[PDB]
């Protein structure tokens, strides 16, 4: 009713349902559709459906790494406005550029229909901006198999 999550209707809904997807007003005003905010969203039953034999086996680690990297970048994007970009460290600039490109490409898909393999390919393309070895959450086999893809596969084919 007033973007209030303490209202009885959203409060009692969370007592019965198995997660939530939350829309963002500032993403909507920035021209991004669909405006789904990855920070407050949560799915309780994600671990049973993903994994080897029902989807690709790198799903969970990639999702966790994306969550951590975006959560890191969103605060550097505010610290820059005070201390200036040239005063940041190198990894902070990497995270800032990743957090910009994430909202630019991964979320703002428009009316396009994306399969799971396409979304995983885009997610791996974004993770290649970060330096190898910073991906603490992903095992070595998946890094050796999927890292290094260019972002031009969606940049030059929007």
């Amino acid at each position: 009713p007033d973007d209030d999550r303490t209202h009885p209707i959203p409060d009692l809904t969370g007592y019965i349902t198995e997660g939530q997807i939350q829309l963002s007003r500032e993403l909507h005003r920035k021209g991004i559709y669909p405006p789904i905010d990855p920070l407050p969203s949560l799915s309780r039953l994600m671990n049973n459906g993903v994994g080897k034999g029902k989807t690709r086996e790198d799903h969970k680690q990639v999702s966790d790494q994306l969550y951590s990297a975006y959560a890191n970048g969103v605060d550097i994007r505010k610290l820059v406005a005070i201390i200036g970009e040239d005063a940041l460290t190198e990894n902070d600039r990497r995270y800032l550029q990743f957090a910009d490109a994430f909202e630019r490409f991964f979320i703002n898909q428009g009316q396009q229909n994306r399969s799971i393999e396409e979304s995983l390919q885009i997610a791996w393309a974004l993770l290649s901006m970060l330096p190898q070895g910073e991906l603490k959450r992903i095992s070595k086999d998946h890094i050796g198999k999927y890292y290094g893809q260019k972002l031009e596969e969606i940049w030059g084919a929007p």
Binding site: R29, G31, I82
Partner: protein
Amino acid sequence: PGGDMSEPVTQSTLRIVGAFWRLDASLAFRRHFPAINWNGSYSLFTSALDPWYRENVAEDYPELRDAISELLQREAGLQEIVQLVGPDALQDAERLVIEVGRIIREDFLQQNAYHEVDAYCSMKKAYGIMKMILAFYKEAEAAIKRGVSIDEILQLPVLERIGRARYVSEEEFPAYFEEAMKEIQGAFKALA
């Protein structure tokens, strides 16, 4: 009652109307009219009217409207820092964003309903004012990279031309617009 927006009538009306123009008491105290609260207002008819605007107003009108909305959103996101550390602690580009947001708020959104000329504004006049403001913003942003300080830029006489384009008559606006667009080039190409 008492300005409480959680009134049952307000909440019942909010779920069925297609547009919502919220007013603010704080803007009305300082005599800033029409005092529409930009942060809590919306319209659901914006997307369906885009083919009409391109045919009748200009081909690039939705892009200009979205560009103005981006500047307003960026200004709204930066005021949480000004209230914490003061306006003088920000960088140059942030100060430019704040000043352009102030220009937009004082000149474009504001409208006097009792003035002889400003009471009615056609669509093309608003389009011209938005074009002037965006051209000034892009030129100032370019001049920032050349090392020119922000407080030097706001002393330019072209700010008076933008700030008083409201009161130009409907049939005199086409000459004023083309004069101001040339003055914009005449300002930033000689400042540095």
